[PDB]
Structure 1
Amino acid sequence: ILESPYVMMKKNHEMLEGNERYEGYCVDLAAEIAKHCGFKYKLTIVGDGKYGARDADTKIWNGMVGELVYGKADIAIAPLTITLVREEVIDFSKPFMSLGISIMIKKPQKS
């Protein structure tokens, strides 16, 4: 999914092709996973803009998780926070980036 600085668009994305059109933090990792596991990779943006939430009515995973459940996508390299219900349908790796709720406030002014 298009996330700064994880997956961003190029300034010459019209000039570039496929995986080269996408820049960001997850792009540098996906080369290294291809360096580790030995595979051709296709970076694809999710359509709906969802991270892979679960619907409460249809109980159908949208986003990137439903692309992994329904066989649409092969793997997900994305800012995907690990919950229990996401692991109930697909498999995560270890948390490479631990984080949490931070406090964004202003900076003391130069007045």
Structure 2
Amino acid sequence: NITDSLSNRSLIVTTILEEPYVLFKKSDKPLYGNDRFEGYCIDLLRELS
């Protein structure tokens, strides 16, 4: 059981804008939250979450 034992526990994740790892979502609405950045390491963040 190495499942979601880290539930709750709001956490701060820091990044730098690089070209192939993070990118803004191309949309009309102003981006807020985890929809601000998308990419491969963001996909790794989704898998880890």
Using the size of structure 1 for normalisation, the TM-score is 0.27
4+ aligned runs moved over 6 Å, structure 1 = none
Residue 36 of structure 2, aligned match among 8, 17, 21: 21
Which runs of structure 2 are paired with 1:31-70 in the superposition (5 Å)?
31-34=46-49
Backbone CA RMSD of aligned residues:
1.6
1:7 maps to 2:22: yes
Equivalent runs, 1:70-81 vs 2, <5 Å: none
SS at match of 1:23: coil
Number of aligned positions between the proteins: 33
Q: What amino acid is aligned across from residue 33 of structure 1 in structure 2?
A: L
Taking structure 2 as the reference length, the TM-score comes to 0.54
Q: Percent identity, aligned pairs only?
A: 58
Q: Which runs of 5+ in 1 are unaligned?
A: 35-111
Bigger share in strand: 1
1:3 deviates by 1.1
For residue 2 of structure 1, what is the amino acid of its counterpart? L
CA–CA distance in 2 between the matches of 1:24 and 1:10? 9
2:17 is paired with a residue of what secondary structure?
Answer: coil
Aligned partner of 2:38: which letter? E
